[PDB]
């Protein structure tokens, strides 16, 4: 599977140009609700691969992302029972939300915008927005880069 419980997961976005050391620059409130992210993800995933030529590795990799999120929803309920209660059953939701939860939130957005705009458009937005935050203020324009 793509998404993982690992601290520094091997090849998370590498195959699609970008890396986590680039997506990190974007704020946490920028990404929408997880349910809406997955609902609009599965929306394009089904109707594009069939019928092709529209077989893109973006929605193809999304199948290994949505199912791996399902592989966590089934896992979390089982962990918060089989062990103890304090810092064993209550810290299960605390592990996913929001650290592990943010990883999928940004991963979904990355692959969704890749089809909505273009892999290059996203990679360009990711580079230019990072460039915007890095710039020492005042010499930096106040108008932040947008994705449209």
């Amino acid at each position, epitope marked *: 599977c793509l998404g993982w419980l690992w601290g520094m997961d091997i090849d998370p976005y590498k195959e699609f140009g970008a890396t986590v050391e*680039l997506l990190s*620059f974007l704020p946490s409130d920028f990404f929408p609700s997880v349910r809406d992210l997955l609902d609009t993800a599965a929306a394009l995933y089904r109707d594009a691969l069939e019928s092709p030529e529209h077989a893109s590795p973006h929605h193809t990799a999304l199948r290994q992302a949505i199912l791996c999120w399902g592989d966590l929803m089934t896992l979390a309920t089982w962990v918060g029972t089989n062990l103890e209660d304090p810092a064993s059953r209550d810290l299960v939701v605390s592990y996913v939300n929001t650290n592990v939860g943010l990883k999928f939130r940004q991963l979904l957005w990355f692959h969704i915008s890749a089809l909505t705009f273009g892999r*290059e458009t996203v*990679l*360009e937005y990711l*580079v*230019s927005f990072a*460039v915007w935050i890095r*710039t020492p203020p005042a*010499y930096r324009p106040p108008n932040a880069p947008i994705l449209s």
Partner: antibody
Amino acid sequence: EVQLVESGGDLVKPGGSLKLSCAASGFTFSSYGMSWVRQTPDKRLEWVATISSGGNYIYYPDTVKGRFTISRDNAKNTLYLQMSSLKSEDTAMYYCTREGAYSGSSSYPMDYWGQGTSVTVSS
Amino acid sequence: NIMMTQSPSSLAVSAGEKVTMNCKSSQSVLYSSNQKNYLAWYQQKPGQSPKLLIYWASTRESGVPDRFTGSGSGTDFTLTISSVQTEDLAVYYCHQYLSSYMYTFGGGTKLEIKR
């Protein structure tokens, strides 16, 4: 193999115009931002302009803004520099450079440089 | 404008010796969010265009010999060649890429061979 080939360099009278071209090969040109860096006779390296992968974001230093225009044609795999109101202090070797940030992390500065085209601004 | 200063302007070393060249930025190039220094080192051999050596102040580019080492943080940085080869005859420049809205380069240090 990454190759950047600049052309267009010439003797131009002060106040004149010149258009530099850079033909890029051995990478997905539309995935990388490109820049121009000039090297003056004192051997100092000076950033001239940058243009994002798509041609959407353009950046200039105070020395060149309003006189130079960076552009690209992702269909011809070419980077351009339209210079106007040329002055003697614009005399330098002009390098076409590929921005590396586009490969993955922000860690990457400009990685490949071309061979350059010399521009002489003189009467 | 973050001005980059390089010292010495030039230095002569004998093959096999260790070399240290310094770079000073007018203001910090350390991110504090990334906790990464936005400093690069380029090598320019005679009759050639520059080639990227080091980025993030300490990380070597793909294909860069182990003898090249970058160190420092904030405003003070160094490039170390331990030990020198005659092939290492070049002008070494430092570059800050924090800004990107106004990229700057150091004046360069000219490495000459003692014989």
